[PDB]
Amino acid sequence: VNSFSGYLKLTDNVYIKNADIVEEAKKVKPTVVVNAANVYLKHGGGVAGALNKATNNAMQVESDDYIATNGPLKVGGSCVLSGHNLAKHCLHVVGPNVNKGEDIQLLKSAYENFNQHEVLLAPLLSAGIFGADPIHSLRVCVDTVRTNVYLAVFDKNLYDKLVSSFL
């Protein structure tokens, strides 16, 4: 038993809710919150900008040190950093950005990072301003992640549609 509440169960291991991941994190304080990152860990907008703002920019400060030491992530890759006031850890995961011209097949690789963590609070990767189809992304998530994932979808009409069309 865990502390996540109000989720629709999609499969044995995938759950979904119409909520702001930031508010879910503040309420639950999960072991792992997933950020929808870019390779530079520049948390300017979307989920990343919102999470970073909620940490009072501490996520960005930590991220800049990470990049200065290690260089950029790979598209499809991830790193584990602090969750600051929101979670124990933040798993920064880079899905492909179609608005940048990247290969959507890398979305499966991105979701594979979730399998290194028994339970996660996450957004849909590559959706929103990353330019991919959120229905697709949900399918890849369900078909790739085997650990317990709680998906927060902020856009209300998207949740509705994803709920009702999920095969």
Ligand SMILES: O=C1CC[C@@H](c2ccccc2)N1Nc1ncnc2[nH]cc(Br)c12
């Ligand atoms: O609705 C959705 C679906 C796709 C995802 C997204 C991810 C990256 C960039 C744009 C959109 N997204 N957006 C949020 N999902 C959950 N929690 C949130 N908090 C603040 C935001 Br913006 C937000």
